[PDB]
RNA sequence: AAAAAAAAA
């Protein structure tokens, strides 16, 4: 019943998160991670629910909601970076229809299996064009590719390939 | 063109 909720605006507070998540169910605790001494926020926080059926509800309901201008990425807490660093179930999407946001991106790929974390990246002028979707399974990822890479999504043709970090790149 | 993230203070 622990949730990682990130992509937070450097000013979002534990109080604002409480007001945000409280509706999903009773909270055990909320904590926004900040730099040891400067206290500068680290752009993410833990939201601990009392009932996992609440944490799960909040995850399946408040995902992508905007706070102080930013869409929050919510996922089950998983402090071991191994999978993330190894992007095995992680795919890359290029050439998005701008009208395409996180939610839209989630719905389109969720069919292939459980996705751990997805984000359509945007900048001041919006949708920026691409994003990623980390599936819990590389079998899921394999099926996403192929069954999506190419075919037109919102008039536009998309490129779906394995993630490939900046180094490989 | 385009190639993310997470330090329980
Ligand atoms: N300080 C903490 N407060 C609340 N829950 C925690 C804390 N540290 C760890 N946990 C939870 O306990 C699990 C196992 O450690 C974590 O994955 C979290 O869900």
UniProtKB/Swiss-Prot annotation:
Q: Where in the cell is it found?
A: Cytoplasm; Cytoplasm, Stress granule; Nucleus; Cell projection, Lamellipodium
The UniProt PTM text for this protein says: Phosphorylated by MAPKAPK2. Methylated by CARM1.
- Which species expresses this protein natively? Homo sapiens
Q: Quick check: keyword Magnesium in the entry?
A: no
Residue ranges of domain RRM in the record = 1-79, 89-165
Q: What high-level taxonomic lineage is stated for the organism?
A: Eukaryota, Metazoa, Chordata, Craniata, Vertebrata
Q: Which UniProt keywords apply?
A: Acetylation, Cell projection, Cytoplasm, Host-virus interaction, Methylation, mRNA processing, mRNA splicing, Nonsense-mediated mRNA decay, Nucleus, Phosphoprotein, Repeat, RNA-binding, Spliceosome
Main function? Binds the poly(A) tail of mRNA, including that of its own transcript, and regulates processes of mRNA metabolism such as pre-mRNA splicing and mRNA stability. Its function in translational initiation regulation can either be enhanced by PAIP1 or repressed by PAIP2. Can probably bind to cytoplasmic RNA sequences other than poly(A) in vivo. Binds to N6-methyladenosine (m6A)-containing mRNAs and contributes to MYC stability by binding to m6A-containing MYC mRNAs. Involved in translationally coupled mRNA turnover. (Microbial infection) Positively regulates the replication of dengue virus (DENV).
* GO CC aspect terms: catalytic step 2 spliceosome; cell leading edge; cytoplasm; cytoplasmic ribonucleoprotein granule; cytoplasmic stress granule; cytosol; extracellular exosome; focal adhesion
User: What does the similarity note say?
Assistant: Belongs to the polyadenylate-binding protein type-1 family.
Swiss-Prot/TrEMBL domain comment: The RNA-binding domains RRM1 and RRM2 and the C-terminus (last 138 amino acids) regions interact with the PABPC1-interacting motif-1 (PAM1) and -2 (PAM2) of PAIP1, respectively. The RNA-binding domains RRM2 and RRM3 and the C-terminus (last 138 amino acids) regions interact with the PABPC1-interacting motif-1 (PAM1) and -2 (PAM2) of PAIP2, respectively.
Quaternary form? May form homodimers. Component of a multisubunit autoregulatory ribonucleoprotein complex (ARC), at least composed of IGF2BP1, PABPC1 and CSDE1. Directly interacts with IGF2BP1; the interaction is enhanced by SEPIN14P20 peptide RBPR. Part of a complex associated with the FOS mCRD domain and consisting of HNRPD, SYNCRIP, PAIP1 and CSDE1/UNR. Interacts with the PABPC1-interacting motif-1 (PAM1) and -2 (PAM2) of PAIP1 and PAIP2. Interacts with PAIP1 with a 1:1 stoichiometry and with PAIP2 with a 1:2 stoichiometry. The interaction with CSDE1 is direct and RNA-independent. (Microbial infection) Interacts (via C-terminus) with human cytomegalovirus/HHV-5 protein UL69.
Q: Which gene encodes it?
A: PABPC1
Source domain of life: Eukaryota
Tissue expr: Ubiquitous.
User: Which residues of the parent chain are present?
Assistant: 11 to 179 of 636
- Protein name, UniProt field: Polyadenylate-binding protein 1
């Amino acid at each position: 019943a622990s949730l990682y909720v990130g992509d937070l605006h450097p000013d979002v507070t534990e109080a604002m998160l409480y007001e945000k998540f409280s509706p999903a169910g009773p909270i055990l605790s909320i904590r926004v991670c900040r730099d040891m001494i400067t206290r500068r926020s680290l752009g993410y926080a833990y939201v601990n629910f009392q009932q996992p059926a609440d944490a799960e509800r909040a995850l399946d309901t408040m995902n992508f909601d905007v706070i102080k201008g930013k869409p929050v990425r919510i996922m089950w807490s998983q402090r071991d970076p191994s999978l993330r660093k190894s992007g095995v179930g992680n795919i890359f999407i290029k050439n998005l229809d701008k009208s395409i946001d996180n939610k839209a991106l989630y719905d389109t790929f969720s069919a292939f299996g459980n996705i751990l974390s997805c984000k359509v990246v945007c900048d001041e002028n919006g949708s920026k064009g691409y994003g990623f979707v980390h599936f819990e399974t590389q079998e899921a990822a394999e099926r996403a590719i192929e069954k999506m890479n190419g075919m037109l999504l919102n008039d536009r043709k998309v490129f779906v390939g394995r993630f490939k970090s900046r180094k490989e790149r």
